[PDB]
Amino acid sequence: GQVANTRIYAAEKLAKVKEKADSPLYAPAVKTLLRDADKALKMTPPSVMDKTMTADSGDKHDYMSMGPYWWPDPSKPDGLPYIRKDGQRNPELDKLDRNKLGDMSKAVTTLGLAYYFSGDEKYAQKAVDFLNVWFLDAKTKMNPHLTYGQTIPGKNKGMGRGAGMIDIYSFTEMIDAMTLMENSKAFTPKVKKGMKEWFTQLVEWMQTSPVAAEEQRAKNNHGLAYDVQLTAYALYTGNQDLAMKTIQEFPEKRLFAQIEPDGKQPLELARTTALGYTIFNLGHMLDMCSIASTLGQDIYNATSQDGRSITAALKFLIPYIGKPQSEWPYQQIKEWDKKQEEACWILRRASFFDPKAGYEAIGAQFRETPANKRIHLIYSLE
16 A cells, blocks of 8 residues: 655556556556566666767766767768757767666666566566666766766867756656665665765766756756756755755746746747657656655646746647647657657646646547557556
8 A cells, every 4th residue: 555755656646556457457558568677687787888989087987978969060071070950860879878878777667667566576686787787886887977968079179068967867767666666675775875875976966067057057948857857866865955945946947937928938949849849848847747746846836927837838739739740830850640649648647737627638539559558557547
């Protein structure tokens, strides 16, 4: 009858889905989750040691990634400096740490959820192997900083930039997966202490680094995402005062700054994937609403004097959901169907906070997500 202390996942909902794992509603998704976890068992845990290049610190244990939208310039003899092509991801980024970090993060989340749903230690043990290799083992560990996040060839004098902070956004969810495994045997006090210390050092770095300062001051989805991460990592590390403060400042610093009275997010709508970025930012807003609700803080209903809110932002998007791209007057260069589907899940999540608005009935009209998809477990109607 225990509810886990999750901050992004809706905890009471998730406890009820677990209790009803074998019911007809959830059994197909649980089956698929355990198949995914079984594939993860076969994976070899990667590390920041796997990249062929080294950051300009000379320390291979420093995380290094490349700005995904930055490409060689064909008008220059050696392609340098790189130039930006918004929305087009340069596959060279695969040489560096970003995708390995993603595989790890996704594997631990999969494994923690599989453990929660099954109680099978093999899932928790493999998760702990991933975490040891990535975070804790002297041989392979990532240092708790992103000084060299999103380097760009030929630019920024070999240094990272604040934008690289977005690379670890999935840690917000990974922390909830680790909480779900806390009572496993593999997830020991030593491992829990190790992880809390790594996140403690990361937060100290976020609070003092000039590189992290760049992300904190970002005006768009990067800034909003920074606060969500700072909050989640502060809570994980026991720093409730920093969490409370970041939450309390979030409507003025982020929501009211980035959302217009008519719901437009102009900095996202200017992008080549304007629908995708509008949804990216909304999903992170809803992540903050969820964290905040655990501390009794009502971010979802925070409303400016001139009418700016998450409700306004949703109201702007809704008329485009389920409609052809001909009806959308901004760019969306790719992933049209994928982002329409994600919009239906934004509606599911918003319905948790404003049931009366009828968001779920709007999304149910168009949503085609197969019954065995994990998302049904995580944003259920419990």
